[PDB]
Design a protein around this ligand. Structure first.
Ligand SMILES: O[C@@H]1[C@@H](O)[C@H](O[C@@H]2CO[C@@H](O[C@@H]3CO[C@@H](O[C@@H]4CO[C@@H](O[C@@H]5CO[C@@H](O[C@@H]6CO[C@@H](O)[C@H](O)[C@H]6O)[C@H](O)[C@H]5O)[C@H](O)[C@H]4O)[C@H](O)[C@H]3O)[C@H](O)[C@H]2O)OC[C@H]1O
Length: 189
């Protein structure tokens, strides 16, 4: 179990970030494994993967995902120039992250249709400090807690709607919670 930060563990990059609010425990396990337990958290994002990511990675994940409230399970990462926070959301709790967002299209990948959206974060935390930036979303219709994600299928679909990615920064399978509670235990490869 560790404090917020980034690093490398057992061959995998990890990032664990929170907004300073208590109630979250993040633990790195062997290999590509991590777990998170949270109770009345604030906002946090943690998981394992790669630094940098690539635009053609096939990401495998498996384990348990037991949110109680607002939470996401996603392939999650960033680019620079442009600065983009992106999500390929495989499962979520009580809140669909695209609520209120303008849909731009659909993509079929890895056994499901996904709906695609762009949103904007204004003056928020980011990998380069406080910033305004776009977010790109693919939201899986058929929720799951194990499988493989062909990231290129999403990135290509996004590109056809002008949702351009820059040079990749990190790319993880992330568990996110937003003022909620839950448990998750995920192995990445
Ligand atoms: O040392 C630094 C290091 O700290 C830095 O790390 C970066 C910092 O930025 C991180 O990026 C964060 C990650 O979180 C991203 O999350 C956002 C949070 O907002 C979410 O939207 C919210 C969704 O819930 C909505 O509320 C609902 C409303 O309906 C109700 O019924 C329901 O109960 C309720 O929950 C809410 O209104 C809404 O605002 C959004 O979905 C989500 O994407 C965030 O964008 C981003 O800022 C990054 O992870 C770290 O790596 O790196 C640099 C070092 O120098």
């Amino acid at each position: 179990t560790i404090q917020p930060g980034t690093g490398y563990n057992n061959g995998y990059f990890y990032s664990y970030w929170n907004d300073g609010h208590g109630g979250v425990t993040y633990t790195n396990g062997p290999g590509g494994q991590f777990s998170v337990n949270w109770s009345n958290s604030g906002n946090f994002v943690g998981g394992k993967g790669w630094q940098p990511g690539t635009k053609n990675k096939v990401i495998n994940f498996s384990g348990s995902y037991n949110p109680n409230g607002n939470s996401y399970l996603s392939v999650y990462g960033w680019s620079r120039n442009p600065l983009i926070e992106y999500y390929i959301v495989e499962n979520f709790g009580t809140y669909n992250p695209s609520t209120g967002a303008t849909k731009l299209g659909e993509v079929t990948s890895d056994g499901s249709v996904y709906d695609i959206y762009r949103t904007q974060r204004v003056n928020q935390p980011s990998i380069i400090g406080t910033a305004t930036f776009y977010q790109y979303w693919s939201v899986r219709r058929n929720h799951r807690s194990s499988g493989s994600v062909n990231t290129a299928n999403h990135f290509n679909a996004w590109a056809q709607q002008g949702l351009t990615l820059g040079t990749m920064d990190y790319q993880i399978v992330a568990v996110q919670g937003y003022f909620s509670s839950g448990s998750a235990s995920i192995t990445v490869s």
